[PDB]
Amino acid sequence: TIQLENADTGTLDTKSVVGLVMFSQFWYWFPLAHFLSLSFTPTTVIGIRGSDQAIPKFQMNCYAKEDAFSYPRMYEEASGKEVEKVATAVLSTTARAKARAKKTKKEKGPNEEEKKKEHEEKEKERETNKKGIKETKENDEEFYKNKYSSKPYKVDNMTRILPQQSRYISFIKDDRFVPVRKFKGNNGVVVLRDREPKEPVALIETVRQMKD
Amino acid sequence: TGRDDTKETVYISSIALLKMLKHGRAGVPMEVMGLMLGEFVDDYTVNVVDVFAMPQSGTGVSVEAVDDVFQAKMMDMLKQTGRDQMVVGWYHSHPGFGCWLSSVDVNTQKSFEQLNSRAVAVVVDPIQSVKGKVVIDAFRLIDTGALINNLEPRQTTSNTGLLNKANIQALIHGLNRHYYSLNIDYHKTAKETKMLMNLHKEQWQSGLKMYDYEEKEESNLAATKSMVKIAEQYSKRIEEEKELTEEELKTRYVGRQDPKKHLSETADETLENNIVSVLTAGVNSVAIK
Amino acid sequence: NDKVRFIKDELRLLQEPGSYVGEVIKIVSDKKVLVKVQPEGKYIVDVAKDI
Amino acid sequence: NNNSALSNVNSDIYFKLKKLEKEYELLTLQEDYIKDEQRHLKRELKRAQE
Amino acid sequence: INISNNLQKALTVKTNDELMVIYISNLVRSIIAFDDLIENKIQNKKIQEQ
Amino acid sequence: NILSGLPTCDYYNTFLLNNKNIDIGLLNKSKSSLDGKFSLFHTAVSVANGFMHAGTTDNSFIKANLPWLGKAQNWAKFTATASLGVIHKGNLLEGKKVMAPYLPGSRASSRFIKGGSLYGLGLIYAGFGRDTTDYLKNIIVENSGTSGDEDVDVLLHGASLGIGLAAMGSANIEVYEALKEVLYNDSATSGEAAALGMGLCMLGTGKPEAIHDMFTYSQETQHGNITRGLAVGLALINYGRQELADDLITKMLASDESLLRYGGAFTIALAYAGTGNNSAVKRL
């Protein structure tokens, strides 16, 4: 996400103010386009163990209901010009048939009475006896965001969190990891108090250090 | 490749634009020609300082109508006073056509390019400068071999992407696809802005110059009379016009060709005049005597 | 602002190359129209995307 | 009363009001300006009519 | 002075015409605004439901 | 180590790795519609690609759509090598290492690639680039003595943008000295990069020597890129200065030329940044 400033003290980010004056002049000189990179800031909640200093895996409680994790898709479809064309073709031929067809219907019926209806004898007493529809029900989510709520869902540690769903975060007190102070109410580096340094903890080892 | 490789933004000096215009206008209808003298800085900034005309011909613009003698001699005159630079290109007039090089000029531009590869051709219309807006455009060739090598996007790198066009079909095909256009901007100092801005020595002393009062009486009489007739027109308009659908009503009862707007306009106009006329008389009577 | 930017935009709009009155003699099914211009002669000429 | 620390938050209202009426001085900034903008457009109206 | 006085009175009549007409439009836009509220209720609601 | 800020560079790389999910159809669309032959078209795509993959390695598009990449030329191609360092941003151990075939001594295919590796290096090491500064300085001093050549100018340009990002905010007097020599040579296009690069480094110092030097030099130059660049660079160096920079704002607005006014506005913006001053807004 693009931030105007740090939200931790509400004080100007230096990388952001420069970034934007350079970016915005770009009818003038096109290579000043990569300067926007200094504005983009990563948004994630980062736990730090107190005894080893590394990221543990554990789950924080996040109140109903998700403002992200959609990941919607882009596509192109050009094969639907063929589907459209035959749909209308099959529709049209029936209309034309209207005059021949009346004469057929009278002769057609006795054939069905004798043999079978369509794949079994059963249910030839009406022309159609079975109508309806199996679903009419659909409301998806019960609101786009339900604020502070009593409904929990679980979120992982190092997940894509935006500030709107970041507020709903409450670090659990069953597990070891609870902040030394309190939460700050936003995304960012936050150091957590390790209850057990001697019980097994699942950790995520940073990418650069594995490769080294 | 290794440079900006784009056509210069021709910055035409305050002197120069007027001088091409005066020189093109005298010869209308016959085609005019001449040299642009200037200096080349950047890779894409040519400031054209001054101009000189190459004399008339009886077959008008030709490559042939270039004469080395006139060009070089006139050049040695300016040398002695040290106002000479280097030939950055040339101007010529199509007053019978729009902005675009004619079939002859593209071949003249090829010779000129050869000598100096930054050579521009500026086509001046002295006959479409009888407007409030001067019609003037600049072009420079992109070679036939160049189009084959597909080096056309090279010329439009590092620009605002704002180009000029002139009519459609034939004119436009020549413009974009065989030559390249770049906008023209106007360059000036604050010394020259003052020289143009000035006028007479009694233009700054023309509000004491009252008018003859016969003429001011005329102004009084006309405005009052005319407003009686547009007012009459204003009465007819608002007798109806109050059913539904606004445009319809305005088409029906003369609400288009609006008298309401026009009555206000006349009144205001004659109103601002007469405040100053009273002001003028009251100053001159008391001030002088 | 509506007023002053209506004047400035009508200065562009008034500037034409000349836009004529023609009459259609007949069509041709190559997607072109034989138009006799009312003063001038006939020219088979393509059509726009609105017609 | 029935809920105490009703004399800390009473004063937060007051604190907020002194901020907000400065941001309606940002509309009195604008007020002079919309007078100098229409003034400018009346000038350029003259220039477009010319 | 006399034509300036007559012209001053003339503009008063055109401007007072405009005065009334703004006030007639307000009366019509009132009707429209009241029907609008029923329609906005359904618009508020749809946003809560989805 | 915590206060150095090294830890936090690492942390952002694992987060970007774990949830990387890239909509491929958007790129396939972009590529198909906007031809790589046309320069504006190619550059637009490249910027978008550098963004999309920023801060994780990804040369996946480059290999797959190598013919499309190969269409580019001039300054669009200058863009295409500068996209790489948006992509490989972070990863400060490997930061020099992955640009090694593109950096000089290892390159000679087009001068575009040699130049834009230097720009893309500055991007990798932004904010932590203090050792990177020495590297890029050497390059500038050797090639600031001559700039009559084509190769030197494209190469020197990236270097000059590069050391801006690397010495950013550091108030390094060395970076100033080195780029000043570029300005004074009065280079074709590296005069812009030099001037911008200087205010990049020297952010909000408001040194009077710098303000005076840059103000005077805008009159002397006669290349259009430099006149603009120095107007912006003035705004940059007078970040946070407010009332300090007030003499310079008055002068730049009053100049009858367009270019000094164009920076002139952004000197208010950066000087009165985040302030709630009616007067700062009233001027603009």
* Concatenated DSSP letters of B1-56: --S---PPEEEEEHHHHHHHHHHHHHHTTS--EEEEEEEEETTTEEEEEEEE----
Of F103, F126, F117, F91, the C-alpha closest to F9 is F91
The Cβ of residue A6 has, within 10 Å, a number of other Cβ atoms equal to 16
Q: Which of F15, F18, F118, F236 to mutate to test the interface with A (most CBs of A within 10 A)?
A: F15
Cis peptide bond upstream of A137, omega within 30: no
Residue F274's nearest CA partner among D28, D17, D24, A9 is A9
Using the Cα atoms of residue A176, residue A181, residue A186 and residue A188 in order, give the sign of their dihedral: negative
Contact (Cβ atoms closer than 8 angstroms) between residue F268 and residue F280: yes
Q: B137 has which bridge partners?
A: B123
- Contact indicator for F15, A156 with CB cutoff of 8 Å: no
List, as one string, the DSSP characters of chain B.
--S---PPEEEEEHHHHHHHHHHHHHHTTS--EEEEEEEEETTTEEEEEEEE-----SS-S-STT--HHHHHHHHHHHHTTT---EEEEEEEE-SSS-SS--HHHHHHHHHHHHH-TT-EEEEEETTS-SSSS-EEEEEEE--HHHHHTT-GGGTTTTS-------SSTHHHHHHHHTEEE--EEEE--HHHHHHHH---TTSSS-SS-PPPHHHHHHHHHHHHHHHHHHHHHHHHHTTS--SS-HHHHHHHTT-SS-HHHHHHHHHHHHHHHHHHHHHHHHHHHHHH-
Enter the tokens of residue F68: 């499309």
Phi/psi of residue A193, nearest 5 degrees: -85, 120
Non-local (6+) Cβ contacts of F203 within 8 A are A14, A18, F168, F169, F171, F236, F237, F239
Separation CA B237–CA A186 (nearest Å): 66
Q: Which residues pair with A190 in a beta bridge?
A: A47
First to last CA, chain C: 35
Residue F9 near residue F128, CB atoms below 8 Å = yes
Q: Which helix (H) or strand (E) holds E42?
A: helix E2-49
**Quick check: A31 contacting B, CB < 8 Å?**
no
Measured between CA atoms, the residue of chain E closest to residue B219 is E3
> What residues of E are in contact with residue A144 (Cβ under 8 Å)?
47, 50
What is the distance between the alpha carbons of residues C11 and F278, in angstroms, rounded to a whole number? 39
Sign of torsion, CA A92 A96 A100 A102?
Answer: positive
Spatial neighbors of E1 by CB under 8 A, at least 6 apart, are: B278
Cis peptide, bond prior to residue F208, ω within 30 of zero:
no
- Tokens in use for A29? 């000189």
F38, F74, F156: best mutation site toward chain B, by most B Cβ within 10 Å? F74
Name the neighbours of E, counting chains with at least 3 Cβ pairs within 8 A: A, B
Residue C37, helix vs strand vs coil: strand
Residue F48: closest CA among F38, F34, F63:
F34
Q: What is d(CA F229, CA F215) in angstroms, rounded to the nearest whole number?
A: 11
Which chain D residue is nearest to residue F277, measuring alpha carbons? D26
- Indicate contact of F with D: 3+ CB pairs under 8 A: yes
Residue among C36, C9, C32 nearest C20 (CA): C36
The sheet with strand A45-48 has its strands ordered as A45-48, A188-193, A178-179
Closest CA to B261 of B269, B252, B271, B249: B269
DSSP label of A40: B
Q: Of the candidates F192, F246, F168, which has an alpha carbon nearest to the alpha carbon of residue A16?
A: F168
C-beta separation of C35 from C42 below 8 A? yes
CA distances (Å), origin F267, targets C50, F210, F234, F261: 50, 15, 7, 10
CA distances from E42 to B181, E30, E37, E38, F101 (A): 56, 20, 9, 7, 63
Q: Which two tokens stand for residue C9?
A: 């935009």
Instruction: Find where tokens 């290492």 sit.
Output: F97
Residue numbers in F near A72 (CB within 8 A): 23
Q: Cα–Cα–Cα angle for A179, A184, A186, nearest 5°?
A: 115
Instruction: Locate all alpha helices (DSSP H) within chain A, ordered by sequence.
Output: 14-24, 80-96, 98-114, 163-166, 207-211
d(CA F141, CA F185): 12
CB F248 within 8 A of CB F211: yes
Q: Which residues contact B157 (CB under 8 A, 6 or more apart)?
A: A30, B4, B5, B6, F39, F40, F74, F75, F76
CA distance A31 to chain B (A): 9
Residue C34, CA distances (Å) to C22, C27, C31, C47, F252 in order: 10, 6, 10, 11, 63
F184 token code pair: 């004074």
- Which among F37, F76, F223 has CB closest to B157? F76
**CB-CB neighbors (< 8 A) of E14 in chain B:** 260, 263-264, 267
Is F115:F76 a contact under the CB 8 Å cutoff? no
Q: Do chains D and E touch (3 or more CB pairs under 8 A)?
A: no
Q: CB distance F110–B161 less than 8 Å? A: no
Contact state of A30 with F43 under an 8 Å Cβ cutoff:
yes
How many Å apart are CA A187 and CA A93, to the nearest integer? 63
The answer to whether the CB atoms of D45 and C3 lie below 8 A apart is: yes
The angle at the Cα of B12, spanning B11 to B17, to the nearest 5 degrees, equals 160
Residues of E with CB under 8 A from a CB of A: 47-50
Structure-block tokens of residue B181: 């256009």
Residues A188/A46, Cβ–Cβ less than 8 Å: yes
**Residues of chain F in Cβ contact (below 8 Å) with chain D:** 276, 278, 281-282
- Side-chain half-sphere exposure of B137, counting CA atoms within 13 A: 19
Angle at CA of residue D8, ends D6 and D14, nearest 5°: 105
Token pair, residue A10, equals 């509400």
Is residue A148 less than 8 Å (CB to CB) from chain B? no
How far is residue B56's CA from residue B33's CA, in Å, rounded to a whole number? 8
Tally the C-alpha atoms within 13 A of residue A167's C-alpha that lie toward its C-beta: 11
- Distance from C-alpha of C13 to C-alpha of A195, rounded to nearest angstrom: 77
- Cα separation, E24 vs B175, in Å, equals 56
- Residue F205's CB: how many other CB atoms inside 10 A? 21
Residue of A nearest to E50 (CA): A143
Give dist(CA B104, CA B62) in Å, integer: 7
State how far the Cα of B24 lies from the Cα of B2, in Å rounded to an integer. Answer: 39
- How many residues make up chain C in this entry? 51
Q: What is the CA C43 to chain-centroid distance, rounded?
A: 14
Residues 6+ apart with CB under 8 A from B236: B253, B254
**Angle at alpha carbon of residue D41, lines to B247 and B274, rounded to 5°:** 90
B94 is in an annotated binding site: yes
Structure tokens at A15: 């990388």
CB atoms within 10 A of CB F227: 23
For the record, the structure tokens of C10 come out as: 């009508």
Chain F CB contacts of D26 under 8 Å are: 278, 281
CB pair distance less than 8 Å for B160 and A27: yes
Contacts of F281 in chain D (CB under 8 A): 26, 29
Q: Please check if B105 is assigned to a binding site.
A: yes
Residues from chain E contacting residue A140 (CB–CB below 8 Å): 50
Q: Evaluate whether F210 touches F237 at the Cβ level (below 8 Å).
A: yes
**CB proximity F265 to A under 8 Å:** no
Q: F187: distance to nearest CA of chain B, Å? A: 8
Would the CB atoms of A21 and F47 count as touching at under 8 Å? no
Q: Which experimental method was this entry solved with?
A: cryo-EM
Tell me, what amino acid is at B125? Answer: D
Burial class of A38 by CB neighbour count within 10 A (0 to 12, 13 to 18, 19+): buried
CA angle E17, E21, E25 (to 5 degrees): 175
- The Cα B119–Cα B110 span in angstroms is 9
List A47's β-bridge partners, or say none.
Answer: A190
User: What span, in angstroms and rounded, lies between the C-alpha atoms of F268 and F242?
Assistant: 8
Nearest CA in chain B to E17: B260
Q: Is A61 helix (H, G, I), strand (E, B) or coil?
A: strand
**Structure's resolution in angstroms:** 4.5
